[PDB]
A paper describes a structure:
The [name] plasma membrane H+-[name] ([name]) is a member of the PIII-subtype of the P-type ATPase superfamily. It pumps protons out of the cell to maintain a steep electrochemical H+ gradient and potential across the plasma membrane. Structural organization of [name] encompasses a cytoplasmic headpiece formed by three domains; the nucleotide (N) binding domain, the phosphorylation (P) domain, and the actuator (A) domain, as well as a membrane domain composed of 10 transmembrane segments harboring the proton binding site and the translocation pathway. Additionally and similar to other members of the PIII subfamily, [name] has N- and C-terminal extensions involved in auto-regulatory functions, the latter being considerably longer and referred to as the R-domain.
Author numbering: 12 to 844
Write the structure that this text describes.
């Protein structure tokens, strides 16, 4: 092996890389353009095989419709079916052209979104500590790896303390493995612990994970959005089958109708009934919504999270990450010291000493500045090693050489862990815990400092038993708008529940000034069923739903808390930040990574914020509902147009044996298809309650609207055929059996009402009251001007249509206008129940 398991070690970098650390950018480019990149491109992009050509189920039925015209014409026996057949292909060509250009445009607008969620690596280039995308990474170079980084390539650790990497999933072993200088690590691994520099070996394609991958197979096959999209497709296809395959076929021999030339009634049901617009419009609506979220501040790593975000019912929010600022502050009056000889004004300095000073943890950054002059924190101390924060240790420490060569060490950490650095007298333990609990009653978190000296003047030897120097009170404080945001979320029907590892007194005290209510519990009490605490009086699951927040949350508890809420049917949003939030984020309905979350948390989460605070999440939830509203309204529209077309033309054929022009319906479909890319760009107001995309309600809303429109179409036909009524009042013309003129009028009436239905379906109140905006009006007016012009002037024997004057068309416009107003009353009536 060139490297791998065998340790070529220090020789290997010198033999190949031939340089150390600061490797110039020009050197990377030559090997980058040679061929190394993180991973291979997906198969079948060549020749625009599926990027210029569609093949959804609806297109398959449309292909049958085109063939059916040829099939039922005996090939060249009947000429107009071929004219329809080329027309059907032209509609498919037009639909495909608009479909694929808009998705391409949406994909171009999501490049920044894809860029935001890309794997990113941290490097020092020209001596400049920098962060770069992982596709820029060069095999054989030196990189910097921090806790919770995703390892981007094979790498050999360079120097520095052992750290723990998690090989689970890649190798399927739960326990993370300690990795030492010189040892190899692999792409896709996540650091559970520690921090080290390393030399990357080979790109992910050369990594064993890339070697293992042979033949590509279905990935996320069961994705819910596609299944509901198919179900909307299934219902409209069923309606055509109910309309055509049964009843129209049923009426042919019961009444002994014409056969060969009756098939046009089947073709109109196919050509107008099938909404090939419907999958494209919904597909691009989410894509533009994600770009809106990218503007908003939320990067939808999962594109389908809009449905879950719209349906979200409860949001479990980390107090430290989302509810509170995290520029912690200490009033030194309440700092209490021990091991006197140290003093209240000086124990802050030790905390500043044990804080990193350049790239800073939020608490580290505060304490560097808390002594007023940041130079004082580092002034002449001559540090020799720094021990960085680790979640199992909860501790930092600085080792330094001072005076005549004394080796001293100072440390910060969580006080319970600091109290075990030298297990103190229980008198001391009771005293420190009393002030810690007093700070918690005050509402302030506690950090403890400690000090030791090492007599053996060496990095690797334990020093003298630690002094428990003291511990200091740190304020959260709340963000300005989180206090509003809980109220806003409550109004929008999402219950915000606090999550924190802080003891309950901190959470309630912060929570009361936040405004969240204090009916909240230690998670450990409610974890499982074995901890009692009056479980019989209130089930833990029932109590958890009632609870307004959870304190002392460990990561096992956090997964359980969402799981219990998710089992209680609630759609659970949950924020996360760290390496051990990943399973809770994965199992949550919406995993939300906070802006400063670890990349492991960003990978595990469905959605990744790039802007901090609970306020951002509620704005994203509110915006997501506004995007979600128009998917339902188009689905109501798409079903409703399908029902009116399917019912209308067959029903006149059933009653008055009237064959409608297939080409005219084809014209309606193209005009509809040309105008429905307004719908994605509408400005519907969000639903206030969460909503879960109940298909039955939207189908019920659409079918009643379409049935009413079909009924008014049938009334229009009867008015201008069997009876004299239409020309009795202001008959500029008069027609009954003038079928080519008559169906031109039917075309014009159907087209206007079909376009107007967009205004009904988008609006929740009166269609007039909710303003349309210019694009929808222009799409309506241009389409209906063209529809009017065809109705007035088209003398086409091929299309069975004869031009019927503007005065008559004006009556059709007037009839459509007075038909339109009770659509809202029908819309209100169906969605009342
Ligand atoms: C909120 C009550 C307002 C009463 C105003 C005075 C009475 C007469 C108003 C005209 C009659 C129609 O009034 C209209 O009814 C429907 C309910 O079906 C309301 O619609 C409301 O309930 C439906 C429930 O499905 C929601 O989808 C919708 O988002 C919501 O706005 C409209 O907000 C209201 O404008
Ligand atoms: N860089 C750091 N240095 C020293 N101590 C730190 C530290 N960061 C956190 N601590 C301390 O460790 C303990 C827990 O820290 P941690 O960051 O895990 O909080 P947490 O994530 O549990 C709050 P929440 O659950 O609300 O997100 C606290 O007492 C804290 O003061
Ligand atoms: K998830
Ligand atoms: Mg931190
Ligand atoms: Mg945290």
């Amino acid at each position: 092996v060139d490297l791998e398991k065998i340790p070529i070690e220090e020789v290997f970098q010198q033999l190949k890389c031939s340089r150390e650390g600061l490797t110039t950018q020009e050197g990377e480019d030559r090997i980058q353009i040679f061929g190394p990149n993180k991973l291979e491109e997906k198969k079948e992009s060549k020749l625009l095989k599926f990027l210029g050509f569609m093949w959804n189920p609806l297109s398959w039925v449309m292909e049958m419709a085109a063939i059916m015209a040829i099939a039922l014409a005996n090939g060249d026996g009947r000429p107009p079916d071929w004219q329809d057949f080329v027309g059907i292909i032209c509609l498919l060509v037009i639909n495909s052209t608009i479909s694929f250009i808009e998705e391409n445009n949406a994909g171009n607008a999501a490049a920044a979104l894809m860029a935001g969620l890309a794997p990113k690596t941290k490097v020092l280039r020209d001596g400049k500590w920098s962060e770069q995308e992982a596709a820029i990474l060069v095999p054989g170079d030196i990189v910097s790896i921090k806790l919770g980084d995703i390892i981007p390539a094979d790498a050999r650790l360079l120097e520095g303390d052992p750290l723990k990497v998690d090989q689970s999933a890649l190798t399927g072993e739960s326990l993370p493995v300690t990795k030492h200088p010189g040892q190899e690590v692999f792409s896709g691994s996540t650091c559970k612990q520690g921090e080290i520099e390393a030399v990357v070996i080979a790109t992910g394609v050369h990594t064993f994970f890339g070697k293992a991958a042979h033949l590509v197979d279905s990935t996320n096959q069961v994705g819910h959005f596609q299944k509901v999209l198919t179900a909307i497709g299934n219902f409209c296809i069923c309606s055509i089958a109910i309309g055509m395959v049964i009843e129209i076929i049923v009426m042919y021999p019961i009444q002994r109708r014409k056969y060969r030339d009756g098939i046009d009634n089947l073709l109109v049901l196919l050509i107008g009934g099938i909404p090939i617009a419907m999958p494209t419009v919904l597909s691009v609506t989410m894509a533009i919504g994600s770009h809106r979220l990218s503007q908003q501040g939320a990067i939808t790593k999962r594109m389908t999270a809009i449905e879950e975000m719209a349906g979200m019912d409860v949001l479990c929010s980390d107090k430290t990450g989302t509810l509170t600022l995290n520029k912690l502050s200490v009033d030194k009056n309440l700092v209490e010291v021990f091991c006197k000889g140290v003093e209240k004004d000086q124990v802050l300095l030790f905390a500043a000493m044990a804080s990193r000073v350049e790239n800073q943890d939020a608490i580290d950054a505060a304490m560097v500045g808390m002594l007023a002059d940041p130079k004082e924190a580092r002034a002449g101390i001559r540090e020799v090693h720094f021990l960085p924060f680790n979640p199992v240790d909860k501790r930092t420490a600085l080792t330094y050489i001072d005076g005549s060569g004394n080796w001293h060490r100072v440390s910060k950490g969580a006080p319970e862990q600091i109290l075990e650095l030298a297990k103190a007298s229980n008198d001391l333990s009771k005293k420190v815990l009393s002030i810690i609990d007093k700070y918690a009653e005050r509402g302030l978190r506690s950090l403890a400092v400690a000090r030791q000296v090492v007599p053996e003047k060496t990095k690797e030897s334990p020093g003298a038993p630690w002094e428990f120097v003291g511990l200091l009170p740190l304020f959260d404080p709340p963000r300005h708008d989180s206090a509003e945001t809980i109220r806003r979320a409550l109004n929008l029907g999402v219950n915000v529940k606090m999550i924190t590892g802080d003891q309950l007194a901190i959470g309630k005290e912060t929570g009361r000034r936040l405004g969240m209510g204090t009916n909240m519990y230690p998670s450990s009490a409610l974890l499982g069923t074995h901890k009692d605490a009056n479980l019989a009086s209130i089930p833990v699951e029932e109590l958890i739903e009632k609870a307004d927040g959870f304190a002392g949350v460990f990561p096992e508890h956090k997964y359980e808390i969402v799981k219990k809420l998710q089992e209680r049917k609630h759609i659970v949003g949950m924020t996360g930040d760290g390496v051990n939030d990943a399973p809770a984020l994965k199992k949550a309905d919406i995993g939300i990574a906070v802006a400063d979350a670890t990349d492991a948390a960003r990978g595990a989460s469905d959605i990744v914020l790039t802007e901090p605070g609970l306020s951002v999440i509620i704005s994203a939830v509110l915006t997501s509902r506004a995007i979600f509203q128009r998917m339902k309204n188009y689905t109501i529209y798409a079903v409703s147009i399908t029902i009116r077309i399917v019912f209308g033309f067959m029903l006149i054929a059933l009653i008055w044996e009237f064959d409608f022009s297939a080409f005219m319906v084809l014209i309606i479909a193209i005009l509809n298809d040309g105008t429905i890319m307004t719908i994605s760009k509408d400005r519907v107001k969000p639903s206030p309650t969460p909503d879960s995309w109940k298909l039955k309600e939207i189908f019920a809303t659409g079918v009643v609207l379409g049935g009413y429109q079909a009924i008014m179409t049938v009334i229009f036909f009867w008015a201008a055929h069997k009876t004299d009524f239409f020309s009795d009042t202001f008959g500029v013309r008069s027609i009954r059996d003038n079928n080519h003129e008559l169906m031109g009028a039917v075309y014009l009436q159907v087209s206007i009402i079909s376009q107007a239905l967009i205004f009904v379906t988008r609006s929740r109140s009166w269609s007039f009251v909710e303003r349309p905006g210019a694009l929808l009006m222009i799409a309506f007016l241009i389409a209906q001007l063209i529809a009017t012009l065809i109705a007035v002037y088209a003398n086409w024997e091929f299309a069975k249509i004869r031009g019927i004057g503007w005065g008559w068309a004006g009556v059709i416009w007037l009839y459509s206008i007075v038909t339109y107003f009770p659509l809202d009353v029908f819309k209100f009536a169906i969605r009342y129940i």
